[PDB]
Amino acid sequence: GLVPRGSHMKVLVAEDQSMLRDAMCQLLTLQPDVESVLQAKNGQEAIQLLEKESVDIAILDVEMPVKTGLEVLEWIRSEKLETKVVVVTTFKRAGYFERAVKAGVDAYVLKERSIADLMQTLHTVLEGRKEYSPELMEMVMTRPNPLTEQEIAVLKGIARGLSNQEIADQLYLSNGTIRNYVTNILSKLDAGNRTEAANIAKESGWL
Amino acid sequence: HMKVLVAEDQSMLRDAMCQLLTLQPDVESVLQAKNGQEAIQLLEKESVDIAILDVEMPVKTGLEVLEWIRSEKLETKVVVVTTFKRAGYFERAVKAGVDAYVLKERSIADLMQTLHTVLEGRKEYSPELMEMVMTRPNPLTEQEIAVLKGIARGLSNQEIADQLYLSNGTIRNYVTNILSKLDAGNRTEAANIAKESGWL
Numbered sequence A: 001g002l003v004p005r006g007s008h009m010k011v012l013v014a015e016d017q018s019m020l021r022d023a024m025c026q027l028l029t030l031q032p033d034v035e036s037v038l039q040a041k042n043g044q045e046a047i048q049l050l051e052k053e054s055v056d057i058a059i060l061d062v063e064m065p066v067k068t069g070l071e072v073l074e075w076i077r078s079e080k081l082e083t084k085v086v087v088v089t090t091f092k093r094a095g096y097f098e099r100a101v102k103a104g105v106d107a108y109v110l111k112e113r114s115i116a117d118l119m120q121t122l123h124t125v126l127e128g129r130k131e132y133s134p135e136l137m138e139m140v141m142t143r144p145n146p147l148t149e150q151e152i153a154v155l156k157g158i159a160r161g162l163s164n165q166e167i168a169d170q171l172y173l174s175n176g177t178i179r180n181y182v183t184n185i186l187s188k189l190d191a192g193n194r195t196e197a198a199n200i201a202k203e204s205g206w207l
Numbered sequence B: 001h002m003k004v005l006v007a008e009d010q011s012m013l014r015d016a017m018c019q020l021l022t023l024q025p026d027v028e029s030v031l032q033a034k035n036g037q038e039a040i041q042l043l044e045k046e047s048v049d050i051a052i053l054d055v056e057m058p059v060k061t062g063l064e065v066l067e068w069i070r071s072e073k074l075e076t077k078v079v080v081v082t083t084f085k086r087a088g089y090f091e092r093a094v095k096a097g098v099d100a101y102v103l104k105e106r107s108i109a110d111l112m113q114t115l116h117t118v119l120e121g122r123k124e125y126s127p128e129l130m131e132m133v134m135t136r137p138n139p140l141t142e143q144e145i146a147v148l149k150g151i152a153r154g155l156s157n158q159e160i161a162d163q164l165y166l167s168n169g170t171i172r173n174y175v176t177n178i179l180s181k182l183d184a185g186n187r188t189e190a191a192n193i194a195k196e197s198g199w200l
């Protein structure tokens, strides 16, 4: 992923707040490692600019008129451009972050960061590495217990070596009902058989 | 030359504004605050020519910093710079004698220009927010407008009453409400005020 243009990078900035866009572009332009900065007020402008010339890094706000930076990210990847993408946003919504990562964003950082932080991010992605907001990583790495009350009881039974039929009896349900829960439980815990499911939910502290 | 303070809770923008201000030839120094409390604390110890204040910030807003600057009677010009178009903010800022109020739609070049403007004793009010706050609905009812137009044609209350098929007491009640609405001393003056206000 390393693009050996760290001393003369061509970037684009899409950001709909005009005072921030202007200030970002002025300071990037002054950096010795930056060759040029293309500026876009919204995601449709970004895309139009990227249709007509190459950039090494696109720096994208999420919330913008017409097309969001997430939509631009997806366009950039669908076009197979040789362009790193750095999302810079105010928003800590987990869904935006997950969407960016599913589109292979190179970095996702918050407007809590400084310009110096941003310059580091741009060198990191151009050298083929990723940078993900620590706060957003944390947020997303902590999951609820995904299991219903019944499913937990089943798993515990499973742990003790019980058959579905034995568990059925214990919970005063039909064998068919227990088999349904197990199916459900395999899918939720991304486990394969019934004993993987059991160590998965215990090791993740869910019983 | 210029000694400025910037108060702005978004870190990336505060950093970028401050670096660019610092680079300006007639800017001497730039003090930074990330909330209004920090801004008041800096202003307690250090003299500043101009304070550039965001509105929405934790703990104390720019509008509260502004008002503090004024009760303290400092020789500090104040420029508010905000994302928000909310009329209330602009109104409160002006009632506290803000020197400039501008939106983050504006450029950094515009901001510099605004700095020179306030230091020259002039004001710079967002053209958009000015137009918004000065644009209100006509304060008169349709019926009141018809009465005023009659008054402007020289008609008596009886003549207007016969024109509108109402009692002259009903016309007298329209006039009474008009006078109070418009704070006018008499019916002919009321018609003058309405006309020149663009309400007929």
Ligand SMILES: Nc1c(Br)c(OO)c(Br)c(OO)c1Br
Pocket (backbone or CB within 6 Å): A090, A091, A092, A093, A094
């Ligand atoms: N992630 C996030 C964000 Br970003 C935010 O405000 O801009 C609010 Br507010 C919030 O919950 O109220 C959440 Br969760």
Ligand code: BEF
Pocket (backbone or CB within 6 Å): A061, A062, A063, A064, A088, A089, A090, A091, A111
């Ligand atoms: F407009 Be936000 F910072 F994505």
Ligand code: BEF
Pocket (backbone or CB within 6 Å): B054, B055, B056, B057, B081, B082, B083, B084, B104
């Ligand atoms: F935080 Be805002 F732009 F007043």
Ligand SMILES: [Mg+2]
Pocket (backbone or CB within 6 Å): A015, A016, A017, A061, A062, A063, A064
């Ligand atoms: Mg935006």
Ligand SMILES: [Mg+2]
Pocket (backbone or CB within 6 Å): B008, B009, B010, B054, B055, B056, B057
């Ligand atoms: Mg703010």
